[model samples]
Target: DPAGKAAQYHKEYALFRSANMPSPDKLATGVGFHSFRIPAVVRTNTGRILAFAEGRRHNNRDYGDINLVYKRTKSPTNNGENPTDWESLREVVGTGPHTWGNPTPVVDGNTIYLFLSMNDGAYSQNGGNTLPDGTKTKKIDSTWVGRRHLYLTTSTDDGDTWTKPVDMTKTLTPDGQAWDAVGPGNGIKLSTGELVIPAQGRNIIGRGPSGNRTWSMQILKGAGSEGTICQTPDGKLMRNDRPGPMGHRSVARGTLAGLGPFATDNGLPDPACQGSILSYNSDEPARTIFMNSASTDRRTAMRVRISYDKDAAKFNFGRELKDAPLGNVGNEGGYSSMTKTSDYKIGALVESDWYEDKGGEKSHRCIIWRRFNLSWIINGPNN
Candidate 1:
């Protein structure tokens, strides 16, 4: 029944950093992190939820001695209750002084495959800069010898352990591309059993042989960056991405084999921040869900939308996350990741901060997990 679903909503403050934190992670040094940024979450086949993020060691800079960190549900709470249900924070991959980030995990049965972007910790995205470890590194440019590369890591024993990451840039990304990134969220295992990894400028497909030996198609330049992929109700792939300039979200919708040119999603304004999309309930009611910061400039005022259409060209109903009950208290409205949890509710890991907006030199960003049902989103951004 269309009305069978009932209203349900729960927001859990999951991960963060504080200067007074305890042992193991001493904060601002070694494997210890002073901030958390770039969220990625997934629900394992066993009905368990795993949340991932970049553990920023020293400052909030994107590149540094960063490590991949995560937490798994100690038990399947289903409804996002019991904040303590989440286990202790654990390190996923921390290889030397190199930076590991942009976690995109796809679950096939009990195995969880995580796609990541790695680069030299000393290097900066724009140009030369001081490294966190007191070393110097070159800029990430077209001619940089070891530009940003992509890698893959897997966890067969659920979130208890993960394999060492293996480089995939040589196979997936082209040579000229100086920088690369993954979904930094959750990649979907499509209804057709195909695995799609939402890469920076392309969608990597796991087609043949255990979903290995992947292939991809580079999206058009000026389209967008940090592309997020989702399947429409009609079996086509839609690429909803961060705008290049300060404008609306850039979207490209077409068949899986070939996607068309990207155009602006006018209704979905942007701050050029990473967004998350989930192909929710494609069989019954044909529902698609998306989440991102809605402001046109800075990362604030996050919003969520629901679309019944195939391409999601027009969101039938929408609501801003900052407006949710207690949502405004902490949400920073930055990078996000979404998934449908085992309980049939939309689960999201949203970025949060306050100091940044208050004119602080550095802010400690964190992630919050919000789980809600369709009834919770019945309200709208309407007149």
Candidate 2:
């Protein structure tokens, strides 16, 4: 759990511990496997870090089998090194057949919820489900071509145990099944004490039962199984019948009560990447969503945008934080995981890809960290 301030990139932000490739787990005497991927966070009342991650015995897998593992640490660490000092890796949960990816953990008092993608069957079609009209739905599935629906597993005793996932998928519109309505990843309790889980989704009608291809974000209501239809504060779930003009997965939320109210962006980036949320100055009064876009064109660059409402009643994006490209050399950004440190700094874990020099093939690898100055996201320093 990162808490504590680091000088503005002026110095080397201490390598929490250079991660080991093939960070294998000893299964038996000489048999072990490597694991790595997005990590879920649950900050305890005493500030104990209960972070969960997907670990695979073998780092290399067209469809790597992953196991749910977690680490705990008291107090926020200097940078993320604190987890290392107290980070103990253990397999807490694992589903059969499919592997886990991009988990979003949330805690309501003592109850912990884990939201991640469950590959339908194997890794053949890359987490998608074909629909009726030749369209496709991007739901988490265990099959080669199936929709990946969002599921909720609850833990009563602090991240140690969890309930089985309850499927929460439905058609936002008429013709299609709501696929890929996964993750409220990082949720927040409103001043009204309501829980808001920012999420994204998409439909490939042409690929699924219907000919549809679209992605957007939906503001989900409730948490765990009690989760119901997504509605606004004013109680409007929209009648447009189209999914995610604003909820396609890479989205996060912060309280923007200070800026009055705001609007909503379908929450998708052209080159797409998952989004995250953080509070300004660690202050709950100002909330904003930070979304990262993925690049499909091979340029290997990404964008980060901070959305806030300029007017109190509007929810459309008012501030575009930063929209420059990252870099091609191992700087890929997608499937991003982010958290606020004790000192209020932000720690981001990017699910990235790398190209082998041999033939230009791409590997679906992930990075658990990429420490960023929260100030850079809030209109960059001057704001």
Candidate 3:
């Protein structure tokens, strides 16, 4: 009788599904906000899905006043069958004149480490008068400028609460890098037991899972915005990057020598938006999954691809999520983050907007949580 109850419990708690959790409506509640951006989802080691984002206060702009927010489900596989299954939205980190965002979370053992990017609201993605390196600078005193910093925090009892954030700016960032950032998405723990977070300008920094804990950062030989990192079944590390106007996605590969000499993967065409990669299967015949806006010019055709050769060559199976009109620049789908569900399914949180026009005005920017079996991804049509 006891075994019967145990087997029944496993059945109901097995698979995660494509049930929308914490939409823009729920995230905007009580904060006088109506928009959400930059979604990050992570399944805790003890089986709980923690969804995070940048809860913009005033408007949809990247700057102004933004706080890191999250919502955790009561159970692992409770896929929004009842919308109330998730807890109330909680603000994990925020400050008045400082903007805290870029929630990059990495789970190690029972503890979850969340890394974020903090910058003075006065000095943001669209601030200051002068242009340094083609982007707006951060005015300090009309004579000097400021830059973004990396901060770290941890949650021991899942995502319910977080410790005070500690600034790691001087330790993590290099001296010469005028600007730096962590993964706007997720990072990966390699097969060799190293934590690597893909960062700005094709760079990654990390240390071992334990031991001396000496950390280091390395930059690849290319230019790109934020990127995602994953491990190949064959033991190599791969970093899929969002490159410039170059139609193809940039990918870098390496082990201990460091990721460098980036190359273009024509197979992964891009509109220069954030993409997500996950090492699905690492058996005799390994497989890596990558998903993004598959169009070379627009973000309308969101597609998922499977690489059987451990991310070395072109993917064998591919399929688009849907078909729609091409978006201008920042419409349609914007950013994506992926993680492996407990039952071996793929769970993803992707950015999608409601209305769009060629003039670049769109609204209702939100995230959709999707989960699908590996068979659905590989056995489907190669779109």
Reference-based TM-score of each model: 0.90, 0.58, 0.82
What candidate 1 gets wrong by more than 4 Å, as runs, is 1-5, 18-30, 76-80, 133-136, 142-145, 209-222, 325-331, 356-361, 381-383
> What value of lDDT does candidate 2 attain over all alpha carbons?
0.40
Best by lDDT: 1
Tell me the whole-model lDDT of each prediction, alpha carbons only.
Answer: 0.75, 0.40, 0.66
lDDT of 2 by residue, 192-299 (tens): 434434344221111111112122233332211111112223322211111223233322122322111122334333332334444333233334334344233321
lDDT-better candidate, 2 vs 3 = 3
Better lDDT candidate (1, 2): 1
| RMSD list, candidates in order | 3.0, 10.4, 6.9
Whole-model lDDT, candidate 3? 0.66
True lDDT of residue 311, candidate 1: 69
User: Pick by TM-score: which candidate is best?
Assistant: 1
Across 48-68, the per-residue lDDT of candidate 1 in tens digits comes to 888888888776678778888
Q: Which of the predicted structures, 1 or 3, would earn the higher lDDT when compared with the native?
A: 1
